[PDB]
From a paper:
L-BC virus persists in the budding yeast Saccharomyces cerevisiae, whereas other viruses from the family Totiviridae infect a diverse group of organisms including protists, fungi, arthropods, and vertebrates. Totiviridae is a family of viruses with monopartite double-stranded RNA (dsRNA) genomes, which contain two open reading frames encoding the capsid protein and the RNA-dependent RNA-polymerase (RdRp). The capsid of L-BC is organized with icosahedral symmetry with two subunits of capsid protein, named A and B, forming the icosahedral asymmetric unit. Decamers of capsid proteins are stabilized by domain swapping of the C-termini of subunits located around icosahedral fivefold axes.
The two-dimensional classification of L-BC particle images identified a subpopulation of 9% of particles missing segments of their capsids. Asymmetric reconstruction of the open particles lacking a large segment of its capsid with the opening centered around a fivefold axis. The borders of the capsid opening are formed by poorly resolved density which may be caused by the limited number of images (1120) available for the reconstruction or by variations in the structure of individual open particles. The structures of capsid proteins from the empty particle were fitted into the other reconstructions. The existence of the open particles together with domain swapping within a decamer provides evidence that Totiviridae capsids assemble from the decamers of capsid proteins. Furthermore, the open particles may be assembly intermediates that are prepared for the incorporation of the virus (+) strand RNA.
Numbering used by the authors:
A (entry chain AP): 499 to 598
B (entry chain CO), D (entry chain CP): 1 to 658
C (entry chain AB): 400 to 598
Amino acid sequence: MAPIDNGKAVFNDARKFSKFMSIMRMMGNDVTATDLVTGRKVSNWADNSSGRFLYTDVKYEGQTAFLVDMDTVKARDHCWVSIVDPNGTMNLSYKMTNFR
Amino acid sequence: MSSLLNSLLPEYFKPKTNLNINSSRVQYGFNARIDMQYEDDSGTRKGSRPNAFMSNTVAFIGNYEGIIVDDIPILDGLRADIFDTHGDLDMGLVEDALSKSTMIRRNVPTYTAYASELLYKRNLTSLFYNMLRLYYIKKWGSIKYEKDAIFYDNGHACLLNRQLFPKSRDASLESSLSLPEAEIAMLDPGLEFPEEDVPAILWHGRVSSRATCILGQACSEFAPLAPFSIAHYSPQLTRKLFVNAPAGIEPSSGRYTHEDVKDAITILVSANQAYTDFEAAYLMLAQTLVSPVPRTAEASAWFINAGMVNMPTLSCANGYYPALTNVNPYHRLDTWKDTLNHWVAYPDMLFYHSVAMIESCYVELGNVARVSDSDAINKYTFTELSVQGRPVMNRGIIVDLTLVAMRTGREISLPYPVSCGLTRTDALLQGTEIHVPVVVKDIDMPQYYNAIDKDVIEGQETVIKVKQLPPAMYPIYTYGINTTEFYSDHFEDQVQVEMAPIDNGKAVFNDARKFSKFMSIMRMMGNDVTATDLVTGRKVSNWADNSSGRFLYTDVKYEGQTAFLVDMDTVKARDHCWVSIVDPNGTMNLSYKMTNFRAAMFSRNKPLYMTGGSVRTIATGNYRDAAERLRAMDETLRLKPFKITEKLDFRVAAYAIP
Amino acid sequence: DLTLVAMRTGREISLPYPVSCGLTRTDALLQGTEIHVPVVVKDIDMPQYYNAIDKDVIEGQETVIKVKQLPPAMYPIYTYGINTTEFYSDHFEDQVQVEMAPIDNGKAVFNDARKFSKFMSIMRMMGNDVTATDLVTGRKVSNWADNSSGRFLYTDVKYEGQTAFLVDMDTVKARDHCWVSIVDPNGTMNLSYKMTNFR
Amino acid sequence: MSSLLNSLLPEYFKPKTNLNINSSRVQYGFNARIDMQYEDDSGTRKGSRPNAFMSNTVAFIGNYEGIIVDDIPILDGLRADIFDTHGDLDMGLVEDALSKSTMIRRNVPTYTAYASELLYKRNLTSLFYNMLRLYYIKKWGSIKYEKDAIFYDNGHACLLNRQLFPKSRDASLESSLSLPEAEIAMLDPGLEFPEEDVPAILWHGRVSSRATCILGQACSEFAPLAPFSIAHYSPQLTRKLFVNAPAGIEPSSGRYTHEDVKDAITILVSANQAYTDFEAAYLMLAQTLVSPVPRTAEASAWFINAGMVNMPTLSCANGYYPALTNVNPYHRLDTWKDTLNHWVAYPDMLFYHSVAMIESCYVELGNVARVSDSDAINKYTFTELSVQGRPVMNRGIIVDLTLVAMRTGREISLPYPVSCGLTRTDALLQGTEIHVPVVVKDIDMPQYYNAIDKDVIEGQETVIKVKQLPPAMYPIYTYGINTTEFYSDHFEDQVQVEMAPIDNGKAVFNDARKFSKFMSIMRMMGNDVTATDLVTGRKVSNWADNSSGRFLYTDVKYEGQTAFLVDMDTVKARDHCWVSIVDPNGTMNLSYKMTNFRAAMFSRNKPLYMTGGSVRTIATGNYRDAAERLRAMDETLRLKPFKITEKLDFRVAAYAIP
């Protein structure tokens, strides 16, 4: 987790940003970040049907740095696992069973 | 002492750097998961509590008073050559040290005579204490104290801030104090006779316009309006304060930021080599900073009488004789600069260390209060048996660090036997019932609380009687590090009790231990049971404290022997898991497991989130380039722990040597 | 002054008498406060680069710059590559690898602070005027911030924060003589130099 | 001698440097745990006092009068060359030494002739004694003396300060003395013939402005208003005092602090090489610093007439012969500098050394007064047999040191047989009746005390006839180290009083020894017993003291035949923490046990705490090992480097040791 200065966490790397928003989606937290180069808002809740986050939802080929809004983290779908305030190194281990 | 108080925090919790406190009240706890399993003669039942919040409440309100007393000198920072082969200050070598470091040798006989009288009273702990308090007044200077607010509120009784704190008005923390300024004069080199009862301190370069105003206000009298923990009444330290600065000091500005106070402390320590003096002041503030909000109405008896804060007398002779302080300082421990290096990096970490300390003290005093006054280790003679040094008096920090040793069960050690800070054991050491003033909210108040007036009306101000002091706080951070039968703060436990025969709709519990186990089970299942004490004729309830979800035997509010008549027909269903049953039959077995701990803090009925980055560890090893451990274990303070040995009575606690 | 020389060369300095006389340099450092240096402006677009007190200043006005952290006053020249540190980067041989894909239209973001310093420095040896812009704060830095040494130290940013430097590689201008040209790059870039003899 | 007075202090006593005295009365003692037991045919009754305070009251008042006597010369200090094999001034080597020096050639023959008389004038004890008194007058200057104050009070008889000390005005210690200054002239090196009956001293460099004022007042008449112990009457030591200082004597300042007197002493001892002279002055002041408040009303006979202090005449001829004093002096004992080095380090330790000496003396004079004249070692001839030296006259320090030798039971050794200081054994050797004045409180006084009148109305000034001197102090510091059966200062003790049921409580003690132990142990148990003598018809009460809480046999105030009727149905419970004797039948068995000891001091009915550093046992070796060490680290400024180390961030720098 990046240091939360005021109420904003800067994610300079591309891979780490993809893993962060992928975790927060599985927990069920609608996080909204601002792309600094373009100046357009990205959201992990882009597709409702398939419950996963792809990096192409940013809608900008090339290199950039994201400013994540940690104060406005809405609670759409909450299991007992779901937390709002991450601290340090985040570990999420999930298992999928009972397909029908 | 950072490394000591840092150890008290639980292994799972590692707090972040910053914490934006915006209120006079903070809840702290954890969200655990409980997996209960019930078995009796009727059959078996299995349940699971998915989210359970166990928390205490701590506030920034506490009536304290300062007294100036004479304490031991801290001989750390002085050059290593003046000390002989042993750890003793020889005046034979002070004459030599001052002689070799000057051209004008006429002044050596005069210099030696004055130095011998002043070196045995050097202590900067009181100056750093006030400088630290000024830092936190400016930082958290938007906390409001309202006079007609609530202090404790259960439903039957209520305590307002008008009571417990008379002679108070409504004010913010910045608006509480209007500090005057003491004269910061310049010491011209050439003055031959040191003026008596005025300390002189060294400084790096020019004294800044802002640094003058801080030193001026730090020495002045503190006279508060609102009762605040970090703005308590303190006497005037000094009238004058000389500063041996090569470049002349600037006049006082009047205004300063909280950032400017950090720059003032960092320079003052580095120049004077007063690192151990800062460590004393750091521990001394950890006691005062926060005060507990009482668990029950009876636990307000602790905070009626104003506790005395023993501030050492301010004396220093570095400004007059700068030859004695050189590049090779004398220190007992090699980890003697850790506490300052910790504070300057992470200032807001002191909040967590303070909560950890005051919890450990007020938890263990819960046991010491229940000890009978006819044993080897009792309330009078527990400190004297524990300490293995030679302090001036068993007061202040020595009392508090003795209770931390008894809690954790480890040997705590300081380099100097300092006796400075708050003494808590004042309400305890007196054979008198304490008169807590309370307000009546419901008409049926006299049935529950031991009130003076047996007939009351909603709005009346009455008084309740407290004979034995109940526990003010429940273990939260120190949960399961060592488990006593009284608190019963286990991770895994199998409680077994035999149900009494239900005659009409009432079950008589003659024994004291069996009654404690019964109501402890029914609470974990979530059944609000109400029993009648037969001797007194007053109603007890297991749902006394809502915050911490456990039952202590002190909720009965009657020291001595009795028999309870439990009402089995009027067993209400407040919180029901699948485990929860109403009709027990035969021998009751409850086996629970606690897993998935995660710390959470609440402030003003919303979640308080930690900001900033992750705290990286700063810590120095036992050796830098030192060959032989010259033990020097004669002057050093050592505090030995005591283990609680459970016995048949259950109402009485007893201590033994491990 | 002698203990600072001992740290630089990495040897043991011995004097016969422990005499304590002369100039004391470490004065502004130990204070640990803001210093207000006066300046007279030339251009009108000054306060974007320098941490100035005013945001709009007409030419020929006397302004003030707020300096918090003290930048190095001299670059190592006589003590060049005898006790080398990665801050100054005073090596004989050095190289940097900036990784770009053709999908990116010249625009590269330096997540790392260390290789950003080496890129901006070697580009100045090659006689190229690069102007990076910080994405978080919104300030600008120029590699041409000296007319003596001809190197870029990281303290020329005049701000300690998070590292996200956007450099647009179609606004690179050839300034000096005896220079290599970057007309239109595509793929991974590899810069390198070698200093052989000294006079 | 610091060494021998240090050994007198108890083992449990751990003294600190500073002692903040703010009154003219101190109750030094210890807290002990007494486990009392009363066994009888009916059953056993157990008691336990956890904090029992046994005290001896010590004041700063006492009438003394100085007289100038002729004493032996102290030859320690002069160069070792002029001395022969036997250890006396071989004149012929003196003439050789003066010839081969920096002296004026025309003065050699005339100065050598005078040497025979002047070189045997070496005694600076009188000067050091007065300069030590000036140190303590300015330090503890704020202590007060009221005229109409209570010197002693036991309920029945009262003794005021007006009674013992007439011609006495109430004033503070600082405002008591108004010392006029003696002339301090500069010695002309080119003087024709030395002026005998005018002492000349040496000095290092320049005599400071304050040193003139101190030496001026030290060599002057002490004419006090209030009867203080450290400001007693002393005659004029000398009219004029020469000082051989090539650097001119500055004129008198007028004012000086207590630190400036330490500066004056350290220069005087070092220049003159007079350490044995200081050791004599230290032991002199140890006797006459504090006087004991009498234990009983009839124990005031010791302090009626003023005891004479023997001050040896001020005589020094070092100023006339500078060549004979150098860096290689002649000394008898190797540990000859230990007494000065101890005082310079710990000045306030003299208070503890003083009480240790007077408590040792007045205890032994208690059990010396109770021996018949027809014996080998008796009242008159106890000093002669003990002394194995050649003093001028058995007075002053010889009589006090021989009493300490009897108490501790060890061999006391001094380098020179000096006979100077206070003589205590004055009222004893007279062997006559002493008439102490008393003001009565009750009307039934003259049954208890041997009064002059048989009927006396309250508020009348009467006289008590004291024949045998009772003990003035009870042993406290010397408790159970050399135990006697008179004081009965055992840890464990028991008494068996044999009674039959036919006797209706009334017991007759034929034995005197077990009567004393019965009456004493009953007072520990807090019972007011009143026995009546059958032969004479007088009465005795065990409650005859409010400090120690013991009954000595000298409280009967009569030597005759022993037939004490005690009625055991008139026993009254007086104190708290007491065992009750409701109705005894058969044989009684009383017993007690003292287990642990903790040092305690009281002043103005409040606890007086010791502050400052930890006092050590300074040895001659502990300083001269640092002289053997010399700090042999070649004084060469070797600066070691630090290699910078780069890590992940690179923004911040990190230095390593190698």
